[PDB]
Amino acid sequence: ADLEDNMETLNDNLKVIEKADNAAQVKDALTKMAAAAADAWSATPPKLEDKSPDSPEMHDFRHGFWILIGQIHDALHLANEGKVKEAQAAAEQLKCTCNACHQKYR
Amino acid sequence: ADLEDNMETLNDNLKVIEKADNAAQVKDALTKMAAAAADAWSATPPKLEDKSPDSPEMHDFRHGFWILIGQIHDALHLANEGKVKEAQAAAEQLKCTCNACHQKYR
Amino acid sequence: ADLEDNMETLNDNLKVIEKADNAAQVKDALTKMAAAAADAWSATPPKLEDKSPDSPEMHDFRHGFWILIGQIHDALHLANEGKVKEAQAAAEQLKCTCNACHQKYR
Amino acid sequence: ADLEDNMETLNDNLKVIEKADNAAQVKDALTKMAAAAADAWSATPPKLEDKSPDSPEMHDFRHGFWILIGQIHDALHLANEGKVKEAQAAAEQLKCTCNACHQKYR
């Protein structure tokens, strides 16, 4: 799917996690984010259209996705332990990742 | 793309790393292994076509990829450092993960 | 060393990284932080001196370190690859982890 | 403690996880392995006693613990979710890391 469509999915489900009542909303949303993150790996963003697939920017770009996927991984385990509040705090920190890539390649 | 196709991309690049001689060979193979692993994230194995996307059977199926992806990510950093023996050793330990999933959902 | 000292090491070397000019400096700081983080593991924060060592608070407190240590590990790889700015970007993110713990336990 | 002792603790609890009946044991066991690995961090093993704490051999030696610690981290989450058998799978899984370091530096 479109990088944009994958971003929108990340964004929708993120908010869903921040306004979640139960651990199940958090689990469902996180699983969805991990899929989006995954399908977004192979994508090349506008600001790097001219760049080489092997350039540092592109390698750094995809690296942000590995970091994200990793932080969603952890988030899920917490939500799985029923520790909702912290699962939400963990989602907040991966936001530190959303911003970073954005400020650099969006 | 397809699961087999991705598993083949996966299976073929593991042997290339095995027969690896230098760092460029290891990187490019791992770089390709990561795209495949990432692309086979949403696939539904055969032995679970009946289970819900949100069922606990899928979560655990998908968990294995998080693991493989994390291991390939780090292995790449090693190959990026010119640490061929190290990188190859890391790859070897991916099997510890490949086999785990296989002896369960293959 | 005690918590305070391992913490001053974390802080000082974090600052070194933010003001670094080359990969050499960052690698050196990250290495010291890896040690300080590893050494701080088993300490009991004062605001938890009354809690049992296996209480949820202490398990959560240690979880903060797993994350921290993991981020210092990845940050270093980036420094070892001569990616100074990316490392500094990773240093900044592991900062979300210093603050997270502190808001909750200091 | 010294390396020997940290290693017994790691060995004693690994087995405890292997023959565990309930999850409580596993959690408790992993937690102790976690502390033993962190403590082993600043250790200089016999075979590398002629190398400095800034050498490639020592960084490779230590990276071995970053790997072990991350695998205990995931093992403990699974044990926290009640997933006991998977926890043992993951535990038997990190043994891959135990050997790999012994085969090279023991």
Ligand code: HEM
């Ligand atoms: C959980 C984290 C993230 C969230 C919630 C998120 C959300 C968004 C949103 C709302 C947009 C605006 C465009 C749209 O979707 O309509 C966007 C765009 C974008 N994101 Fe993210 N994003 C995230 C992570 C990332 C990461 C980690 C990277 C890179 C490593 C990244 C790279 C981009 C790029 C380059 C665009 C622009 C795409 C275009 O203009 O076609 N994003 N994201």
Ligand code: HEM
């Ligand atoms: C890098 C390690 C891995 C390698 C080298 C690998 C390799 C392969 C190969 C060559 C096959 C044989 C059948 C075929 O190719 O058509 C296969 C099948 C399969 N692998 Fe893996 N695999 C790995 C990791 C994993 C992981 C992590 C999972 C689980 C999360 C997994 C799930 C599967 C499944 C479900 C099949 C059967 C596909 C089907 O029947 O359509 N594999 N793998």
Ligand code: HEM
């Ligand atoms: C790179 C990240 C970190 C930095 C830069 C940092 C820095 C500091 C500094 C400068 C202090 C004050 C030292 C003092 O007590 O005199 C401190 C205190 C403390 N930090 Fe951190 N810290 C970090 C991560 C952590 C983490 C992740 C945890 C918990 C998991 C933690 C827990 C604490 C606690 C509880 C104190 C109080 C120490 C005491 O009362 O003796 N720190 N930290």
Ligand code: HEM
């Ligand atoms: C679950 C993981 C591990 C287990 C069960 C384990 C177990 C052991 C045991 C039983 C010994 C026997 C010698 C003695 O106790 O005096 C030992 C020694 C040792 N281990 Fe491990 N170990 C583990 C992981 C590691 C890792 C990850 C490294 C390196 C990164 C490592 C490095 C060593 C070294 C260097 C020795 C030799 C110490 C000496 O000769 O004084 N081990 N370990």
Ligand SMILES: [Zn+2]
């Ligand atoms: Zn965790």
Ligand SMILES: [Zn+2]
């Ligand atoms: Zn590594």
Ligand SMILES: [Zn+2]
């Ligand atoms: Zn990385």
Ligand SMILES: [Zn+2]
């Ligand atoms: Zn996990």
